[PDB]
Amino acid sequence: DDFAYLNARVRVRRGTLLKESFFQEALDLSFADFLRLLSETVYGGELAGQGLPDVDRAVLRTQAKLVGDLPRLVTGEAREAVRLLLLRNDLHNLQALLRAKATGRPFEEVLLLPGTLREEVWRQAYEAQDPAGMAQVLAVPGHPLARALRAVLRETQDLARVEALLAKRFFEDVAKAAKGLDQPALRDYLALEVDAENLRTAFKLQGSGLAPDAFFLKGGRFVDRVRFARLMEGDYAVLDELSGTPFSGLSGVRDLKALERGLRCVLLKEAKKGVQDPLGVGLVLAYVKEREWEAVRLRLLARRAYFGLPRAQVEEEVVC
């Protein structure tokens, strides 16, 4: 462990982060001009065709090389900390894949965050014949989500419950690994990720009649068991009671889309606090999250330009 060498490599990578004016110009371009603007960034080195799927592939391959290689640059404790960040992105990816598969979204529209598994592993998991085949695909590289998915599917096959319990189980495992590190920035970010997952789980399971304690994740900071239970009962005022916390901007949120938007913005702002940290995981955490948000926004704006959607239909989604 230490982050000195990694940090110096990352400060050089941050020089290729896309600036805000990229995203502001892109809102008003045709798809040809979007492609041109993209070709002048670091993503242009992976842009191999002129169609929408080519932009998505250019994003995936670029992020693989600028983020997915990070654990190779550190060892011991520092490597464990970086690995946890990427694993949390594998959890996002599996959740996104399950929901796509269940709801009729093709694999090509699934947002894959930079993680520890190759794209072809996710495609194979999507394509598998049944959930057993999906788990075996994850088990070949020995990924810990394979066992977690098996354990959750034994208990329930309802999509929203499977997503919630998979997160619960992942964060319960991350917590044991994370407790063995001493990274104050990671401790603050993890506590906020727990609060956020609790809020999304409570919102999604609202009115199902479930007992909240099977679903509540410990380890948070601002979202207590009683508010989680109240929101899972259908009390939306919980989202209005968070003044004085990082979640105070959730006030007035009354749909999942606006929730997930709000949550991503809260976590990005928190990840940004550590960009100038000389010690520990803060700078790599900030860099990974900024690259995540860059990928999310590139895919949305690529679609807006390709299909010619109005700017107001998408601007709210790409700004915090």
UniProtKB/Swiss-Prot annotation:
Signal peptide: none annotated. Belongs to the V-ATPase V0D/AC39 subunit family. It comes from the Bacteria. One of its GO terms (biological process) is proton motive force-driven plasma membrane ATP synthesis. GO terms for cellular component: proton-transporting V-type ATPase, V0 domain. GO terms for molecular function: ATP binding; proton-transporting ATP synthase activity, rotational mechanism; proton-transporting ATPase activity, rotational mechanism. HAMAP family: ATP_synth_C_arch. This is V-type ATP synthase subunit C. Keywords: ATP synthesis, Hydrogen ion transport, Ion transport, Transport. Produces ATP from ADP in the presence of a proton gradient across the membrane.
